Design a protein around this ligand. Sequence first.
Ligand code: HEM
Ligand code: HEM
Ligand code: HEM
Ligand code: HEM
Length: 211
Amino acid sequence: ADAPFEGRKKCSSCHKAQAQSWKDTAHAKAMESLKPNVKKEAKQKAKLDPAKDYTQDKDCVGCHVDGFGQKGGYTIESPKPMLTGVGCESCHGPGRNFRGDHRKSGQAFEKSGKKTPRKDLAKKGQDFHFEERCSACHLNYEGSPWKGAKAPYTPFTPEVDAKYTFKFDEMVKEVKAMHEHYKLEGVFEGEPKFKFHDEFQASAKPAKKGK
Ligand code: HEM
Ligand code: HEM
Ligand code: HEM
Ligand code: HEM
């Protein structure tokens, strides 16, 4: 019983600093790349049509939106702006079930300092590991080292250009590709905890924008 996707809106309303930074990332602009005449040079190199409209192409949208083919996720028939672009749930997991726990646990902490185990969030679908999710978009090509690969494949592979080589441990540390990291008070605790969480929090910026 995995959880349904719902879109970025509620996440962004509670996490304004991360949302503001995420908006400037290539992930947030992913659907723009599928539009005609955008990234013409890159498309030519990959032997795609620079003038074609790929925004409703099922061979392309799944890696440029949230939750394609998944419950509550993006559909070409009724495409939600809040699921357009690679958004919050594409990395952190579909949020319909865990988002309410962020609200309740946040209120419990503000009122009484009570912390909540991350295990409770993982049970509700939140992802604290990320690698498989990033890989399903970035390493989904024929003969890829990632064994979950299956069509449709990304046209942007190491064969096309070495700049498309993907190494999770390196790229998850590119803030300009994730979003800047801001300091957490520590409402959630324990495992499963992302392997680089303490590192990211140790150099995180202070609560910038919102509250
Ligand atoms: C939308 C589904 C959504 C996402 C995505 C999201 C992510 C998120 C992360 C990654 C954390 C950190 C967890 C950890 O410590 O490992 C986090 C923490 C908090 N959130 Fe959140 N969050 C989403 C939605 C919401 C909503 C709608 C609210 C507000 C009602 C909210 C609140 C919080 C709070 C509070 C925390 C703890 C912050 C702290 O300082 O420790 N989130 N969220
Ligand atoms: C998982 C945490 C994850 C990582 C790590 C990751 C990295 C990453 C980088 C470094 C880029 C390049 C950014 C830039 O050049 O400015 C990038 C770009 C795209 N990604 Fe990604 N990405 C992660 C996760 C995901 C997921 C889950 C998907 C598919 C739903 C995905 C897709 C894309 C796409 C598409 C781009 C390009 C956007 C564009 O320019 O149109 N990524 N990612
Ligand atoms: C479908 C034919 C399709 C199109 C069209 C498309 C376009 C596209 C562009 C223009 C980019 C940016 C490349 C650049 O160098 O700036 C881009 C990037 C990524 N895509 Fe995409 N894409 C199409 C399909 C798919 C599919 C089916 C997947 C996932 C299986 C996918 C994934 C990605 C990823 C990952 C990137 C980022 C590459 C990087 O910069 O590292 N795309 N796409
Ligand atoms: C979508 C706009 C979005 C939100 C909202 C969001 C929130 C969020 C929080 C609150 C954290 C913890 C504090 C911090 O700033 O580090 C957090 C951490 C990570 N995120 Fe995130 N995040 C949003 C989008 C995305 C996207 C699209 C990706 C993947 C390309 C991504 C990845 C990460 C990673 C990795 C971390 C570190 C996790 C940790 O330290 O526990 N986020 N995000």
